[PDB]
Amino acid sequence: SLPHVNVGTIGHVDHGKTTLTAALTRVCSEVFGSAGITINTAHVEYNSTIRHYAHVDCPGHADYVKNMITGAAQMDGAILVCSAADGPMPQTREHILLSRQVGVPYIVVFLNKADLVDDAELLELVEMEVRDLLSTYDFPGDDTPIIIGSARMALEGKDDNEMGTTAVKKLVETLDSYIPEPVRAIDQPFLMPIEDVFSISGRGTVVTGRIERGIVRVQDPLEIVGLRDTTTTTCTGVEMFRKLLDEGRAGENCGVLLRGTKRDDVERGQVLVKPGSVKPHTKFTAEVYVLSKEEGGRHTPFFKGYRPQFYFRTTDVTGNCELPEGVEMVMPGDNIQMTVTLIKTIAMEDGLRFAIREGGRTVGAGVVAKIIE
């Protein structure tokens, strides 16, 4: 019955990510607890005194790109592993960038392989490089907790000079205090993506869907957002399988009974929300992973002016893609940032995920990085 927090290890190949993952389970055991698109992930769990951690680790760079953009769980925090012996390397940079793009709110650093460094100046040098890297992508580099140690010593139950077990312990306690309790879906502002719309003989409207987050109750005031100008409405009932109720909750499939809505003020793909909670937008920055030929996507490389369908929750909307300055094409299996302009408005926030399709043939997965307009 402990608070659930999603974490993971990021950084360059060979810097110690998988080892630190194993050390974390061992150390938490000894000091606290117990123990289409193809994506290789390893999953692990450990408890501190106050939290249950669900921890993801991926083999290679390509896995991190796909998982962070379209992976099963969104990290509430990421542990950046950087080798103190080697200093930062290309995927040290790119994984911080990708964390920014994907909306990972916090990053903690473990400077690994301290057993290999007998040189205070080198540790200082590498720490400064990493703080700078973090600040380059708007993480608070100067205030980032950086723990120095040896994941491998910890994994082997060694703790000479507190480099091993103690350091991984300090890491977990940093997780405890630096990453806030995430807000559960049930406690966020109400949102349901609309699927079907049925007029109750002109006396009201049922809009159906699966509540994505929050709670809706009889008498609640609501807005209908996207595709056309926002309208207001009032909930007068909730239809569930077999039952008419006064309430519906995140996770539940229902029909929300509405009054004050005009037949065609409401359609599929709009979102029913707590008033003032989400706004409609058309233009945004996005990190996109373009599917592989093998993954059932495209074999063709596309160019500037590409106009695919963007799928957001329960509908799709045509959009124009602008590549970054210096790029003319994008091959299958690439991941790039691009600026997108939709033909119609749609409810959206930073961190919202979407699919890209051509004629019902999935070609990309993306996340909204930054809303423009």
Ligand SMILES: Nc1nc2c(ncn2[C@@H]2O[C@H](COP(=O)(O)OP(=O)(O)O)[C@@H](O)[C@H]2O)c(=O)[nH]1
């Ligand atoms: N000397 C030393 N080697 C380490 C440490 N942590 C990991 N390694 C070694 O680095 C190599 C790659 O580590 P691994 O955890 O698989 O790196 P990953 O690719 O980041 O997942 C392995 O041979 C590890 O034993 C450490 O603290 N000290």
Ligand SMILES: [Mg+2]
């Ligand atoms: Mg690994």
